[PDB]
A paper describes a structure:
One of the best described Siglecs is CD22 (Siglec-2), whose expression is restricted to B cells. CD22 plays a critical role in establishing a baseline level of B-cell inhibition, and thus is a critical determinant of homeostasis in humoral immunity. CD22 is a single-spanning membrane glycoprotein of 140 kDa on the surface of B cells. The extracellular domain (ECD) of CD22 is comprised of seven immunoglobulin (Ig) domains (d1–d7) and 12 putative N-linked glycosylation sites.
Our 2.0 Å resolution structure of unliganded epratuzumab Fab indicates that its paratope is largely pre-configured for binding its antigenic site (r.m.s.d. of 0.50 Å). Consequently, we next characterized the antigenic surface of CD22 recognized by two leading therapeutic antibodies in clinical trials: epratuzumab and pinatuzumab. Binding competition between epratuzumab and pinatuzumab revealed they recognize non-overlapping epitopes on CD22. Epratuzumab functions through an alternative mechanism, whereby it acts as a CD22 agonist causing prolonged B-cell inhibition, in addition to Fc-dependent receptor trogocytosis. Here, we show that epratuzumab is capable of binding to CD22 with high affinity in a range of pH’s, including acidic pH’s corresponding to early/sorting endosomes (pH 5.5–6.5) and late endosomes/lysosomes (pH 4.5–5.5)46.
Residue numbers in the entry:
A (entry chain L): 1 to 27, 27A, 27B, 27C, 27D, 27E, 27F, 28 to 94, ...
B (entry chain H): 2 to 52, 52A, 53 to 82, 82A, 82B, 82C, 83 to 99, 101 to 113, ...
Amino acid sequence: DIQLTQSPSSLSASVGDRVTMSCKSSQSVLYSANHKNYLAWYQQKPGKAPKLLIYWASTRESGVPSRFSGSGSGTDFTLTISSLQPEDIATYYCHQYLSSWTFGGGTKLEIKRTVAAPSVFIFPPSDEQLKSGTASVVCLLNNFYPREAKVQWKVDNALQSGNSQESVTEQDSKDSTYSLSSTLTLSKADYEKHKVYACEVTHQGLSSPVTKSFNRGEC
Amino acid sequence: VQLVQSGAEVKKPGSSVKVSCKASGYTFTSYWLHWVRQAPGQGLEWIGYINPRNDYTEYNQNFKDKATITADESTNTAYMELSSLRSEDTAFYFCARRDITTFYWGQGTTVTVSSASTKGPSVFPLAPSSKSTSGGTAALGCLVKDYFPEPVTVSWNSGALTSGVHTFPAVLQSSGLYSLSSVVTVPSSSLGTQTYICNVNHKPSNTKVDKRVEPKSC
């Protein structure tokens, strides 16, 4: 029914910045009986329930830091964070409760920092896994910013597809970097069929792609 | 004055699940109780609500053939039941109520729908070497592979080592089994002159493994 549009979908800002995000409703959420705007703002950390920041568009929750404030009336609302702090890395949601509940799409907020190239590490499969009949090669990208990075696996210079999987940590609260871990998995017989195992890493902090590589049998 | 939801659920496709939301510290029939879904990496989606005073219910159109919300004033407990579970039902489920002064959300309940069955992981070393060294920094870790369901917990040196330890989010493999890596950033000088042990626990399979990670010379 009443749709909510949040913008931007993502925000990057330095600690201490003033930050604003907007929420616009398809219809007015200002109720005629009490002249109250049925709009709330939430902060949500991963794996956790959303935490209420603002209710009735402008009333701040009791325990919430005074750096958070809400403004607007009718169909256009704004959440402002006066001085961005490192603990504010989260996804922010607007929520209208005038009619049946609807939510904005969220604003993912991250800390902006100096570009940092990843340290690239590679781990050959262990003797224990090989005894079991499989070989996993792990490529590690440590403490880089920004989050966008490309990891390509190459076996004897052949690009690999459909045999690897990666995961990225949440942004670190101390140095505002990300880390990424990628596992390439082959059967032991297929692993023993090739010599060079390499992960090629592309990142804004790298003037050229970096390759971490090893030869089967060398470790 | 809090809403307490039942624990994590792992279900096979085709089964049903009923999650509970206990309300305490207020009058249970005085406020509508809502349910909200959040699929992994996605936003918040309203499921429906119940008026516990007269058992009146309304649902999001998208959940009409999936969710049934009930309540019991006599036990001050609300329920949300999901029928004929499928993989797309894997999500976070919250109960939430609105007061005059504030909102109260439950802590959330994960529902994981998978055909896979319980399995303990193998813990393989991620051996440090020149291939995992840069300057005065070396990386080592443990690969915790092929387990179900979540979660696994990893400590290093029985909890005595926390600096430079980061555990990555698990990845769901095509087999339907999770895999996770836990790594540690250490001074390169400590390789060979410091013992590193990863302690892996998977309680669903009663798996407990302590793996020494020893350096390789390459």
